[PDB]
């Protein structure tokens, strides 16, 4: 019973290289709002979350264009927008009352800041930001999202019910970073994520400066099975995959981080054009605001086991267009000392082509579970973390505060 509601050519905002591009745009009755260069030709996998305008608001501006939507929703723990443009008035009404009619017909179906102390500020967004934490009470360390409540809820009984089931639905996968807390005040609202104390993976890699096949496999079987939970169980792109957002706990197992907010990108003045934050592991088909789904986060995979075998960015150069360039078109090289199973996993993740990407297929992670790269790896003992780390994290606990000293200054 899926079917289009509305149908034609929007002009879109770039999500990283904000300029216009002019994009074809899908409605369906599921709640799926989806753009394309060209308006394809033909559905049978299962709808992404990520396209969904279930549970949003949509906003209409002058600024910084005339005729101007936007459809802002909170997805999991972080406030996104999309912003849309049409020539007329008129035609901007036609999509908002039908975006609101599909949005509608979805529709039917004590924690406080004092037990928490400062310690940092880890990001400043848009509708809010995130601060490191600590728990008085046991020690842990958090990391606490706080948002704008206005951005998201109208009143304080459904944002109520919002922070209550947040704690509840929340995914129980051991290398992601779980929601552990969530409560509002009066004009503001938390997510209380928890913060792994095993160093960042940035850290550890700079140090070794390379991995080995043995201990990337491990970290990358690991990334597998968290992207395979998010594909398969929660319908949604991770779209976030780098170094940055991995990190180690205490006992060496990989926490895929939760800590971001949409920020306004930084002018450089080449030619005035707006980018958000740094493209070196955006997939080329997001790069390019083109249709995208779960091959997403196999690109980001690739991205990252590259640099752990590699010692190096797949994809880097100081100029951004030349950057995007290299992203797009050239060929990625391995080095001479990287195994053939290793290329072969690497170059099929990194293929240009999401439809031929490794793990593009209706199969997603399981084409990468039967690669012969993680041949031997037994993928249940993997999620039940039956594998030992081969690398252990110097802390005595989950409350050791080594890499959060004058320690990690080396
Ligand atoms: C340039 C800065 C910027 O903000 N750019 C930008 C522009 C437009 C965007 C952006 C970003 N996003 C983000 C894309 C990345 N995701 C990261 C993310 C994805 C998924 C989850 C997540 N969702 C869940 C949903 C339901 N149940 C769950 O259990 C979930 C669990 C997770 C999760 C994943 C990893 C670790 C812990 C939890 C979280 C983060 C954020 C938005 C964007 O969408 N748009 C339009």
């Given at each position: 019973?899926?079917?289009?509601?509305?149908?034609?050519?929007?002009?879109?905002?770039?999500?990283?290289?904000?300029?216009?591009?002019?994009?074809?745009?899908?409605?369906?009755?599921?709640?799926?709002?989806?753009?394309?260069?060209?308006?394809?030709?033909?559905?049978?996998?299962?709808?992404?979350?990520?396209?969904?305008?279930?549970?949003?608001?949509?906003?209409?501006?002058?600024?910084?264009?005339?005729?101007?939507?936007?459809?802002?929703?909170?997805?999991?723990?972080?406030?996104?927008?999309?912003?849309?443009?049409?020539?007329?008035?008129?035609?901007?009404?036609?999509?908002?009352?039908?975006?609101?009619?599909?949005?509608?017909?979805?529709?039917?179906?004590?924690?406080?800041?004092?037990?928490?102390?400062?310690?940092?500020?880890?990001?400043?967004?848009?509708?809010?930001?995130?601060?490191?934490?600590?728990?008085?009470?046991?020690?842990?360390?958090?990391?606490?999202?706080?948002?704008?409540?206005?951005?998201?809820?109208?009143?304080?009984?459904?944002?109520?019910?919002?922070?209550?089931?947040?704690?509840?639905?929340?995914?129980?996968?051991?290398?992601?970073?779980?929601?552990?807390?969530?409560?509002?005040?009066?004009?503001?609202?938390?997510?209380?994520?928890?913060?792994?104390?095993?160093?960042?993976?940035?850290?550890?890699?700079?140090?070794?400066?390379?991995?080995?096949?043995?201990?990337?496999?491990?970290?990358?079987?690991?990334i597998?099975?968290?992207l395979?939970?998010?594909?398969?169980?929660?319908?949604?792109?991770y779209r976030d995959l780098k170094?940055?957002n991995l990190?180690?706990?205490?006992?060496?197992?990989?926490?895929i981080?939760?800590?971001?907010?949409?920020?306004?990108?930084?002018?450089?003045?080449?030619?005035?054009?707006?980018?958000?934050?740094?493209?070196?592991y955006?997939?080329?088909?997001?790069?390019?605001?083109?249709?995208?789904?779960?091959?997403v986060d196999?690109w980001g995979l690739?991205v990252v086991?590259?640099?752990?075998?590699?010692?190096?960015?797949?994809?880097?150069?100081?100029?951004?267009?030349?950057?995007?360039?290299?992203?797009?078109?050239?060929?990625?090289?391995?080095?001479?000392?990287?195994?053939?199973?290793?290329?072969?996993?690497?170059?099929?993740?990194?293929?240009?082509?999401?439809?031929?990407?490794?793990?593009?297929?209706?199969?997603?992670?399981?084409?990468?579970?039967?690669?012969?790269?993680?041949?031997?790896?037994?993928?249940?003992?993997?999620?039940?973390?039956?594998?030992?780390?081969?690398?252990?994290?110097?802390?005595?606990?989950?409350?050791?505060?080594?890499?959060?000293?004058?320690?990690?200054?080396?």
């Amino acid at each position: 019973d899926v079917a289009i509601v509305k149908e034609g050519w929007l002009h879109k905002r770039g999500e990283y290289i904000k300029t216009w591009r002019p994009r074809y745009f899908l409605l369906k009755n599921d709640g799926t709002f989806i753009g394309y260069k060209e308006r394809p030709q033909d559905q049978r996998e299962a709808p992404l979350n990520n396209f969904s305008v279930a549970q949003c608001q949509l906003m209409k501006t002058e600024r910084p264009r005339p005729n101007t939507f936007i459809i802002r929703c909170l997805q999991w723990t972080t406030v996104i927008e999309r912003t849309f443009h049409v020539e007329t008035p008129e035609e901007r009404e036609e999509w908002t009352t039908a975006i609101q009619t599909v949005a509608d017909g979805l529709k039917k179906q004590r924690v406080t800041m004092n037990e928490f102390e400062y310690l940092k500020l880890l990001g400043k967004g848009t509708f809010g930001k995130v601060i490191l934490v600590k728990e008085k009470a046991t020690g842990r360390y958090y990391a606490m999202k706080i948002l704008k409540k206005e951005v998201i809820v109208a009143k304080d009984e459904v944002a109520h019910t919002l922070t209550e089931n947040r704690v509840l639905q929340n995914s129980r996968h051991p290398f992601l970073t779980a929601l552990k807390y969530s409560f509002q005040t009066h004009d503001r609202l938390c997510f209380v994520m928890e913060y792994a104390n095993g160093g960042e993976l940035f850290f550890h890699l700079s140090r070794e400066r390379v991995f080995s096949e043995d201990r990337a496999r491990f970290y990358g079987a690991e990334i597998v099975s968290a992207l395979d939970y998010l594909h398969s169980e929660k319908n949604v792109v991770y779209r976030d995959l780098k170094l940055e957002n991995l990190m180690l706990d205490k006992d060496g197992h990989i926490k895929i981080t939760d800590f971001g907010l949409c920020k306004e990108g930084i002018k450089d003045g080449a030619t005035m054009k707006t980018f958000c934050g740094t493209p070196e592991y955006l997939a080329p088909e997001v790069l390019e605001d083109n249709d995208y789904g779960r091959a997403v986060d196999w690109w980001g995979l690739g991205v990252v086991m590259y640099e752990m075998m590699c010692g190096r960015l797949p994809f880097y150069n100081q100029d951004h267009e030349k950057l995007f360039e290299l992203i797009l078109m050239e060929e990625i090289r391995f080095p001479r000392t990287l195994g053939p199973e290793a290329k072969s996993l690497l170059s099929g993740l990194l293929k240009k082509d999401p439809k031929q990407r490794l793990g593009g297929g209706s199969e997603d992670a399981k084409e990468i579970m039967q690669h012969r790269f993680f041949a031997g790896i037994v993928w249940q003992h993997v999620y039940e973390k039956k594998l030992s780390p081969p690398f252990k994290p110097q802390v005595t606990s989950e409350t050791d505060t080594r890499y959060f000293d004058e320690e990690f200054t080396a």
